[PDB]
Structures are given as structure tokens and as C-alpha cells.
């Protein structure tokens, strides 16, 4: 289910997911000087059922209620204490990410700039957004 590759990097652009599909993983990374808790989870996994989706196997290195999402997708997980500044996500087949040029850069490409993970020829591959930011 996981896509081996990360979504395409477009120079002078960034991407972000609208919501995370069930199966999405996020590494339990910690900040400099802080280590991952003993026998703890190495990854958080987005899971779900007929009533809700949520993140299982919580990371460990503020708000007491961590709300579940509607079924099929998870929301951006809340920050955990002493977490690394960069988030390492691993997406599954069917996941879409959306692009925007960085402020000060513009696109000639008309319409939506998106990338989807597809299972093509027995292997996973992200579609190429036809996007150039100048």
C-alpha cells in the first residue's frame, strides 16, 4: 500500500495534503538532544472504521482531547513534545497532494497542480504535476 517514493519535488513550489488516507505513516522523530522513548512506537499510523479515523501508535520524545476525524481520512496530527521540526510522511496508493508556487514565483500551468500515488505496472509511482514556478 505504501508508495516507495515521496511525492515529486517541484522547484520553487511546495505541496500539502488536504487529509491523510488510512495507511499513512509518520516517523516518530525527535528534536536535537531528545531521543525516542524506550520500546515506543517508531511510526504513527492513520487507521479507521465505519464511524471515525484516527492516528494509532502515538509518538513519544498539549491539549487533552485529540479529536478523531470522519472515516477514510485523518487530519494533521497535533504536535507532540520535543518533536523534530521536519515531518517525515509515508503515503499510500490513492493519496493526493496539492501544489502552490512559493511566494514571489508564478506558474504558467493553468488550473490545478496535484500529484496522486498510483499503482502502475505492479509498482507505485506519483503522477507528475505539469508545474514550473518562475
Amino acid at each position, epitope marked *: 500500500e505504501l508508495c516507495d517514493d515521496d511525492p515529486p519535488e517541484i522547484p520553487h513550489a511546495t505541496f500539502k495534503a488536504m487529509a491523510y488516507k488510512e495507511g499513512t505513516m509518520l516517523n516518530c522523530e525527535c528534536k536535537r538532544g531528545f531521543r525516542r522513548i524506550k520500546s515506543g512506537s517508531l511510526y504513527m499510523l492513520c487507521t479507521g472504521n465505519s464511524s471515525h479515523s484516527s492516528w494509532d501508535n502515538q509518538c513519544q520524545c498539549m491539549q487533552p482531547v485529540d479529536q478523531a476525524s470522519l472515516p477514510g481520512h485523518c487530519r494533521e496530527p497535533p504536535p507532540w513534545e520535543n518533536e523534530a521540526t521536519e515531518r517525515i510522511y509515508h503515503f499510500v496508493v490513492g493519496q493526493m497532494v*496539492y501544489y502552490q508556487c512559493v511566494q514571489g514565483y508564478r506558474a504558467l500551468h493553468r488550473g490545478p497542480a496535484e500529484s496522486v500515488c498510483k499503482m502502475t505496472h505492479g509498482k507505485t509511482r506519483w503522477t507528475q504535476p505539469q508545474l514550473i514556478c518562475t
Partner: antibody
Amino acid sequence: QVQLVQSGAEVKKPGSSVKVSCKASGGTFSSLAISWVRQAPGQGLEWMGGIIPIFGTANYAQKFQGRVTITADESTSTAYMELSSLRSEDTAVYYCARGGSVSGTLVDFDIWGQGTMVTVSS
Amino acid sequence: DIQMTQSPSTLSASVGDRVTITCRASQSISSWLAWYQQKPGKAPKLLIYKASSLESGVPSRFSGSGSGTEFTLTISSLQPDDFATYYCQQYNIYPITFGGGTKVEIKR
């Protein structure tokens, strides 16, 4: 293909707030900017601001003096424009419009909503 | 703010005529200029973006030209659907600003 459907006409007293909605019909918002432009009766077009859905980044015209708030609900593909401390000069047709490219909020507007007449009067 | 000045404010023309509408910016806007058509009671419609790129579905009788501070919209051989108001828009810098409009009306 993608269309923008706005909420119905509003009649408001001065000093109140109005919240107009702009819903995508026959598609989704994507990361294309959703912006708001108004036109006072018999006048030209005036930009109010825009938001980038998903990213959440919003820009506003300073002349509104913080009276405009623009938000987007990605799950229902609906954008909102809230204008506070309404005055008679805010009487206008308010339009929402989608950006032509993923170039933030400094874009041409390729798809427009039908417009929402807002009348501010005592 | 960048002030966009359109001229003429109004013009009278017949079906078959060529019309040229001008948009001048108070400062350079590179080529970040778009042209719209608007009929009474309706939303504006995008015709041209980036000063000269024709929008998908818009007839080829519409063409835009210009850079910096001077831009034109030309309609070659005007048709009944073209009597409307036209507006230019700059999107070089914030705030986004529009020209005052040019009404194209039927000569009789």
C-alpha cells in the same frame, strides 16, 4: 466544468456582520486561490482579498481595515467571506472567483460565482 | 496602490467594426494584466490573462497586447455578443486593482 455557487441576497443593518458563502459545484477547490471582489451599484470592481485552500494563507486589501475575514472548508469545498461593522457604502454585489493558476493570491480569476447582493441600510 | 486607468470610458461601434480599449498602469505591472467582459446582472468573464494569453473557450477575435504601463484589448470584427463592459485587472502587486471599465455600446 467547475462552478461556484454563492449564497442568497442579504439585507443587513449598519454595524452588523455578514457572512457570504461560495461553494464549488461539480468539482473541488484544489489549492487554487478563492478570492472575493465586490461591485457597488453602477461602479467598477474592487478586490477584497483571497485565501489559498489547504495551505490556509490569506491576503486582504488594507482599505478594509481588518473588517474582512476569508476562510475555506476543504471537506465541503466552501469558502466564506465575513465583512464586519457594515456601513451603507458596503452595499454591493459580492463575487467569489477561483484563481487561474497555483500562483498564490496574485492571479487572474478564471471562474466566478454568480454574485451575492448585500444591502446595508437602516 | 497601482491605479489602472481605462480609456475610453465608453465607445459606440457597429457589428463588424474593430474596437481598441486601452489600460494604463500608474507604475510598471510587467505583463500581469487580465481583461474581463461583464454584462449587466452577470459575473465578469475572463478573456485574456498575462496581457496576451487568450483564455480557453474565448473567441480569437479578442486579443491583448502590452507590457509595463500600457496595454490594449482589441476586438476585431465586433459581434452582437460583444456589446458589454470591459475591465482590466493588474496582479503584479497587492492590492489587486481594476480599471474603471469601458462600455461598448451599439452605434445607431
